[PDB]
Amino acid sequence: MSEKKQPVDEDNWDDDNVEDDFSNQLRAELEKHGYKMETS
Amino acid sequence: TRPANHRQLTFEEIAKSAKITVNEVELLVMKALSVGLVKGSIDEVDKRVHMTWVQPRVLDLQQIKGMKDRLEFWCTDVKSMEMLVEHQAHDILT
Amino acid sequence: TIRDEIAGCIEKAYEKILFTEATRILFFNTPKKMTDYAKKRGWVLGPNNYYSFASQQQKPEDTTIPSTELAKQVIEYARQLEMIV
Amino acid sequence: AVQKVVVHPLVLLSVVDHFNRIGKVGNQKRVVGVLLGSWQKKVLDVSNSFAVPFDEDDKDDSVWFLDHDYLENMYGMFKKVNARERIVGWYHTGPKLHKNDIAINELMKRYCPNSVLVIIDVKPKDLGLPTEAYISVEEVHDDGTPTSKTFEHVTSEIGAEEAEEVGVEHLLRDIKDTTVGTLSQRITNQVHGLKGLNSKLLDIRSYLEKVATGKLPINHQIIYQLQDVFNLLPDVSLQEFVKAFYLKTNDQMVVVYLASLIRSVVALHNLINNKIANRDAEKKEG
Amino acid sequence: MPYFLLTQAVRTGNLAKFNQVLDQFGEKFQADGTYTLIIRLRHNVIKTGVRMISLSYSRISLADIAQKLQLDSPEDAEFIVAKAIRDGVIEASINHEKGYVQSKEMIDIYSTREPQLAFHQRISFCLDIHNMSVKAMRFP
């Protein structure tokens, strides 16, 4: 404005929530998905 | 006779009143279905009897008193709710 | 102020809880606090067990009770339609 | 037989104004005239009418007499000026018929095969749609009593064609018309509960009164049967009426959404075009 | 950035993931004075985990659920659910013998109550848009 308080101090986002779920969980993932095969 | 409804009956009730076998209660109730005094459908899986409609016959003095009490019971209720419907709609009419 | 909350928060809603199992939370040995709870709760006292009957409790339906306020809400809602008009 | 009747305001007025004729000369009783109807289908229609002098002695309280020659001449004039018009029955202003009115129909039944009598009300008071319509039939009875003639109710409605709507709507100059969509449905919404209540309340006071006084019959037969029919419906949930809840609301779902859909469009065109036509038109003036 | 990692670990059902962020990134929260939420947010993390597990599992064992949420003991497994029922978090009915926890899915009331409550805000807001448009429209 700049008056008063402030001088004192589809889209891809909806799916980017789920991507954030993929970031902290199960990586992507390829390698682990391929490593779980020979474990048992 | 039952205040009901709660109009569903049971095979044991007809088997006790009519003192007949369970296999004959079929033609029993179905005869009345053909006559038309009652339209109630019969549950033959649980042998239960489900009555519908009713056949009015005569009346009793006690039944007139119960009548006018149950009858006025309707007018007081519908008038009380109706006046609420016009209560909220009174200021927007004028 | 915690102990009365054991009684309040155990039910609703649990199907049943065994005798000595609740005795593990009330501590003591065979206190009269659980007898006073057999009064206050009521609720049920069963042999070597307990019960939330009946049933879980009061069984709200609520059938035709909410149809009154369901009509009532629409009354003033239609009034808001008439305020436009 | 006859299902419903249609009575125009013109002929109705023709009863009322004759009530002003005999009003100044008085005295007792009620206006009695012969109705002119028009029958184009099973639905009945009334256009005009003609009054007839009628007097009821009191001694003789069941004595009733009409003018037949005057009836002939006036109906002949109206048949002369209008070929389509004909007598469908008779009429009186009531307000309540008397037992003697059963034979009045039997007289003129030589003129018309089925003569429908129409009560009217000159002074509007209560309880709703005016007048009345009765048809003369014989239902016998299950008792085997000699045949009793009781008139049966026929639903009546006020209507018109073209020119008769003109004057009626023109002379009022009182209340808004109609107006459909806003004040036509809400006012009649309160009319539904109000006219339902007072009808039910006067008649339900009658039911409690009939057993104390008015016996016999009264009750029976017609009373108890319809009584049980009244006890046929409680009428609510359980059960499926519970399931009609969310689909009624779900019928409101799309309606609220369409509402909010166009509400933003109204604000669109209005605010956009007006703010432009406000500041951009004022800046050129000053 | 530190704050964003906070909410990232908050929406998750892992409790240890949440306790790590306060340790590493608390130094920034000191400056904002935002520690007032960090004590009361734990309640919301446990409620989130139990909500997930409630809808995502028909029948769950109270002893086996503690290992995933690092609940650590059998006794608090009853406590979280006790207050969950008390606050209306989960409608499941629980039997204590072993014990076990079973859950049921009830519906159909649903769109009766929830949409009409929203409509009360929707329509009132739309007519307010109408009033605010009429106000600025009548000035010329």
DSSP collapsed to 3 states, D47-98: EEEEECCCECCCCCCCCCECCHHHHHHHHHHHHHHCCCCEEEEEEECCCCCC
Do A and B touch (≥3 CB pairs < 8 Å)?
no
Give chains near E: 3+ CB pairs under 8 A: A, C, D
Place of tokens 């409804």: B5
DSSP state of D147: P
Nearest to C84 among E82, E116, E127 (CB): E127
**B73 interface with D at CB cutoff 8 Å:** no
Q: How far is C76 from chain B (nearest CA, A)?
A: 7
Which stretch of DSSP H or E encloses residue D144? none
Do E and A touch (≥3 CB pairs < 8 Å)?
yes
Spatial separation of the C-alpha atoms in residues D207 and D223, rounded to whole Å? 9
Burial D10-48 (b: 16+ CB within 10 A, else e): bbbebbbebeeebeeeeeeebbbbbbbbbeeeeebbbbb
> Are the C-beta atoms of residues E46 and E40 closer than 8 Å to each other?
no
> Are the C-beta atoms of residues D278 and E139 closer than 8 Å to each other?
yes
Cβ pair C64:D236 closer than 8 A? yes
> Are the C-beta atoms of residues D134 and D152 closer than 8 Å to each other?
yes
Spatial separation of the C-alpha atoms in residues D191 and D197, rounded to whole Å? 10
| Structural biology method used | cryo-EM
Rg (CA), chain B: 21
Spatial separation of the C-alpha atoms in residues D155 and D134, rounded to whole Å? 9
Which stretch of DSSP H or E encloses residue D284? helix D243-285
Spatial separation of the C-alpha atoms in residues C65 and A29, rounded to whole Å? 54
Identify the three-state secondary structure at position B68: helix
At D122, list the tokens. Answer: 């000159």
List the single residue in A with minimal CA-CA distance to E4.
A20
Residue D6 has φ and ψ, to the nearest 5°, of -125, 120
At B7, list the tokens. Answer: 């109009």
> Are the C-beta atoms of residues E9 and E17 closer than 8 Å to each other?
yes
Identify the three-state secondary structure at position D285: helix
Nearest to C83 among B84, B85, B92 (CB): B92
Cβ pairs bridging B and D (under 8 Å) = 57
Spatial separation of the C-alpha atoms in residues C26 and C22, rounded to whole Å? 6
**D236 interface with E at CB cutoff 8 Å:** no
**C63 interface with D at CB cutoff 8 Å:** yes
Contacts of C81 in chain E (CB under 8 A): 123
Nearest to C82 among B84, B85, B92 (CB): B92
Spatial separation of the C-alpha atoms in residues E135 and D229, rounded to whole Å? 56
The dihedral built from the CA positions of residue C69, C75, C78 and C79, taken in this order, carries a sign that is negative
Spatial separation of the C-alpha atoms in residues D32 and C80, rounded to whole Å? 51
Contacts of B67 in chain D (CB under 8 A): 227
Which of D67, D73, D92, D74 has its CA nearest to residue D15? D92
At C1, list the tokens. Answer: 């102020």
Q: Which amino acid is at C20?
A: T
Helical segments of chain C, H only: 3-10, 19-26, 33-40, 65-82
**B75 interface with D at CB cutoff 8 Å:** yes
Cβ pair D187:B93 closer than 8 A? yes
Spatial separation of the C-alpha atoms in residues E83 and E81, rounded to whole Å? 5
Nearest to E124 among C10, C70, C80 (CB): C80
* Residues D211-220: contacts with CB under 8 Å, at least 24 apart: D211/B64, D211/B68, D219/B59, D219/B64, D220/B58, D220/B59
Q: Which amino acid is at E120?
A: H
The dihedral built from the CA positions of residue C37, C38, C41 and C45, taken in this order, carries a sign that is positive
Cβ pairs bridging D and E (under 8 Å) = 54
Identify the three-state secondary structure at position D33: strand
> Are the C-beta atoms of residues E82 and C10 closer than 8 Å to each other?
yes
Nearest to E93 among C9, C15, C73 (CB): C15
Contacts of D245 in chain E (CB under 8 A): 112
> Are the C-beta atoms of residues D86 and D35 closer than 8 Å to each other?
no
Burial E100-137 (b: 16+ CB within 10 A, else e): ebebeeeeeeebbbebbeebeebbeebbeebeebeeee
Question: Given its phi and psi angles, is residue B49 left (phi above 0), alpha (psi -120 to 50 degrees) or beta?
Answer: beta
